[PDB]
Design an enzyme around this catalytic site. Structure first.
Site, PDB file in Angstrom:
ATOM      1  N   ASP A 137       0.824  -1.209   0.000  1.00 14.72           N
ATOM      2  CA  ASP A 137       0.000   0.000   0.000  1.00 14.72           C
ATOM      3  C   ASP A 137       0.862   1.265   0.000  1.00 14.72           C
ATOM      4  O   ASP A 137       0.612   2.213   0.744  1.00 14.72           O
ATOM      5  CB  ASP A 137      -0.972  -0.001   1.185  1.00 14.72           C
ATOM      6  CG  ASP A 137      -2.035   1.094   1.078  1.00 14.72           C
ATOM      7  OD1 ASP A 137      -2.255   1.623  -0.038  1.00 14.72           O
ATOM      8  OD2 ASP A 137      -2.632   1.449   2.120  1.00 14.72           O
ATOM      9  N   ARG A 141      -0.242   9.148   1.147  1.00 13.75           N
ATOM     10  CA  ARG A 141      -0.803   9.155   2.498  1.00 13.75           C
ATOM     11  C   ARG A 141       0.013   8.316   3.480  1.00 13.75           C
ATOM     12  O   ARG A 141      -0.111   8.512   4.695  1.00 13.75           O
ATOM     13  CB  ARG A 141      -2.249   8.640   2.476  1.00 13.75           C
ATOM     14  CG  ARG A 141      -2.374   7.113   2.399  1.00 13.75           C
ATOM     15  CD  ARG A 141      -3.827   6.617   2.508  1.00 13.75           C
ATOM     16  NE  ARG A 141      -3.878   5.168   2.742  1.00 13.75           N
ATOM     17  CZ  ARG A 141      -3.926   4.603   3.950  1.00 13.75           C
ATOM     18  NH1 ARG A 141      -3.945   5.358   5.045  1.00 13.75           N
ATOM     19  NH2 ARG A 141      -3.963   3.282   4.069  1.00 13.75           N
ATOM     20  N   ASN A 142       0.799   7.360   2.984  1.00 14.89           N
ATOM     21  CA  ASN A 142       1.599   6.470   3.814  1.00 14.89           C
ATOM     22  C   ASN A 142       3.064   6.871   3.863  1.00 14.89           C
ATOM     23  O   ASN A 142       3.898   6.091   4.340  1.00 14.89           O
ATOM     24  CB  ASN A 142       1.461   5.026   3.329  1.00 14.89           C
ATOM     25  CG  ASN A 142       0.196   4.372   3.834  1.00 14.89           C
ATOM     26  OD1 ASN A 142      -0.247   4.661   4.946  1.00 14.89           O
ATOM     27  ND2 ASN A 142      -0.407   3.506   3.016  1.00 14.89           N
ATOM     28  N   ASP A 155       3.278   1.999   7.396  1.00 12.53           N
ATOM     29  CA  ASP A 155       2.140   1.133   7.076  1.00 12.53           C
ATOM     30  C   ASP A 155       2.507  -0.046   6.178  1.00 12.53           C
ATOM     31  O   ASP A 155       1.617  -0.667   5.587  1.00 12.53           O
ATOM     32  CB  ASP A 155       0.994   1.936   6.435  1.00 12.53           C
ATOM     33  CG  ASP A 155       0.034   2.512   7.466  1.00 12.53           C
ATOM     34  OD1 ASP A 155       0.102   2.083   8.635  1.00 12.53           O
ATOM     35  OD2 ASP A 155      -0.795   3.382   7.114  1.00 12.53           O
TER      36      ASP A 155
END
Ligand SMILES: *CCC(=O)Nc1ccc(OC)c(Nc2cc(-c3[nH]c(SCCOC)nc3-c3ccc(F)cc3)ccn2)c1
Ligand SMILES: *CCC(=O)Nc1ccc(OC)c(Nc2cc(-c3[nH]c(SCCOC)nc3-c3ccc(F)cc3)ccn2)c1
Ligand SMILES: [Cl-]
Ligand SMILES: [Cl-]
Lengths: 314, 302
Positions: A137, A141-142, A155
């Site tokens: 992922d 955002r990570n 993450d």
């Protein structure tokens, strides 16, 4: 072993919610060391439940792996609390995530920052590949901002740990990041370091568009079809063809034709040495990397760990 | 020099008083980087009026020296705000100062911490001595706790930059205002005595006006209840009249490090089996969260 601290509920408290994602809810928290009276800020993530009834020993085994990473561009898991539910503890990053950062500073971000972020993310992912860890992922955002000059991946491995119900692979903008995924992951759930490279290309696109949403307006259910027809994300207006071509190579159908993270480090490092040749940004000379004075000050207050020097312009 | 950032008044804010001393008031503050939306905790010391005001250029010159210290056991000055007042900015130490810490934990501190704190303070002072810098105000209140396993000396250079700690001072400093590395060694001995008594006031109930006469008679602070004579003899040598008879900081590092390898042999503390250093698990957690700088290894027992 000694890398993952087992916390009791009595020694930490969730204080203020910060947001949520597919993997869980994040809080600013406070760690209270046993026998002390100080309250130490921490980031706490309360995970969603796994799609399978995994043994607690495998959750712990996976968390030990997450606590074992040692690289300046990868966030290390520091602690875990296992009750009825799983809670992850790590260092709190007051600057937040890079996706929010580029959206909120769009007109203040120069080429030196953008290209150095690409270098640092590639270094973190190359370390994950060396540790034989597939992220699954990678997205803006990570990527977390420790300082504006120092970003770190988080993450990783949570998608493999918690899983996803296959209904979500066909839902509209749900918990499965369809629009970041390689075609082979969408079609056959194949996840490799080379499908991480696909998501790296989308992540770069997010940065170069200052946080636009990929394939905005296109249903998640149609992404595999438009990808098979050869459609890809458009060229961001600030990107020269050299940069766009790297992104396009990341999205080739044949996974082993895509760049490797170790090659992406080198090419983005080369571009950072002449940043205005590869990204065209009005006012770019106002937006240089911080002076040695400001860098020394930032690192003493907020960022004492070791890291590779950022790449300055020649 | 790039080691000292000069700050505008508009980019930080005092939010709470943490304490005060002979040199000024200390605030918890928030640094607001221009164009950013975050507020970063800092510690701010607003200095009082210097006895004889110094030229701004001289204040800056001394600030640059203070920002130049690079050692894991000395606090580095990070920034300065020079307006109608002088405000010094450093990293905030949420655990506070070592004097308050040993008092709060009077019934919970193990011998391994106490001896390791002695090592770390000596390492910081040895660094300052190598730089030919005299502290002039070493005391338990001027040692800060970054984590319980990692302490750092603060307030270096403030004394000469600018309410006189008579009971920490060497006799030649009381008599003739002479300050040297060997007079810093005297104060180091008093500081160790403070730690080993869990923060007792030295010469309690004795007027400061009497101290120089008591020292000339040969009397000194007493042996702390927990100290074997090995530790107390070190203190007494620190308080010898002949400044060159006192030990060197380099020697103090060696001696306290040896004792820290067998701590229960040198400090006799009720229920010392109660307490001890953090496991590697708790040390890695402390470091990753709030102490990422490079530091010498702890001295553990047998
Ligand atoms: C991209 C959205 C975001 O992260 N915003 C944000 C806002 C304010 C913050 O502190 C002031 C932080 N700091 C932070 C965040 C995380 C973290 N972020 C995420 S994305 C899901 C929603 O998050 C708000 N996950 C984490 C996390 C992973 C593992 C863990 F053990 C704890 C938290 C980590 C550290 N600091 C972010
Ligand atoms: C022994 C008294 C003490 O220091 N208490 C205390 C309580 C709470 C704190 O944070 C929560 C801190 N943290 C701290 C203190 C200092 C600092 N301490 C001193 S001694 C005078 C009394 O101060 C409270 N001076 C300073 C200082 C020197 C230079 C500078 F630029 C800023 C501050 C520094 C960092 N963190 C202490
Ligand atoms: Cl999430
Ligand atoms: Cl003071």
């Amino acid at each position: 072993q000694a890398l993952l601290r087992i916390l009791k509920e009595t020694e930490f408290k969730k204080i203020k919610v910060l947001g949520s994602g597919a993997f869980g809810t994040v809080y600013k928290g406070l760690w209270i060391p046993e026998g002390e009276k100080v309250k130490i800020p921490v980031a706490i993530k309360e995970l969603r439940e796994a799609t399978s009834p995994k043994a607690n020993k495998e959750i712990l085994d996976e968390a030990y792996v997450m606590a074992s990473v040692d690289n300046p561009h990868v966030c290390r898991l520091l602690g875990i609390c296992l009750t009825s539910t799983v809670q992850l503890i790590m260092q709190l990053m007051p600057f937040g995530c890079l996706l929010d950062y580029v959206r909120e500073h769009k007109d203040n971000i120069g080429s030196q920052y953008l290209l150095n972020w690409c270098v640092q993310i590639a270094k973190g992912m190359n370390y994950l590949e060396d540790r034989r860890l597939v992220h699954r992922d990678l997205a803006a955002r990570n990527v977390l901002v420790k300082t504006p000059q120092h970003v770190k991946i988080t993450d990783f491995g949570l998608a493999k740990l918690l899983g996803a119900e296959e209904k979500e692979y066909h839902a509209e903008g749900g918990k499965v990041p369809i629009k970041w995924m390689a075609l082979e992951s969408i079609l056959h759930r194949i996840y490799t370091h080379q499908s991480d490279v696909w998501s790296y290309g989308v992540t770069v696109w997010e940065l170069m568009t200052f946080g636009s949403k990929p394939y905005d307006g296109i249903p998640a259910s149609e992404i595999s079809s438009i990808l098979e027809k050869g459609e890809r994300l458009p060229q961001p207006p600030i990107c020269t063809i050299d940069v766009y071509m790297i992104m396009r190579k990341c999205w080739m159908i044949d996974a082993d034709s895509r760049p490797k993270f170790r090659e992406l480090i080198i090419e983005f490092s080369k571009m950072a040495r002449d940043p205005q040749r590869y990204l065209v940004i009005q006012g770019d000379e106002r937006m240089h990397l911080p002076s040695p004075t400001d860098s020394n000050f930032y690192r003493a207050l907020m960022d004492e760990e070791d890291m590779d020097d950022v790449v300055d312009a020649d």
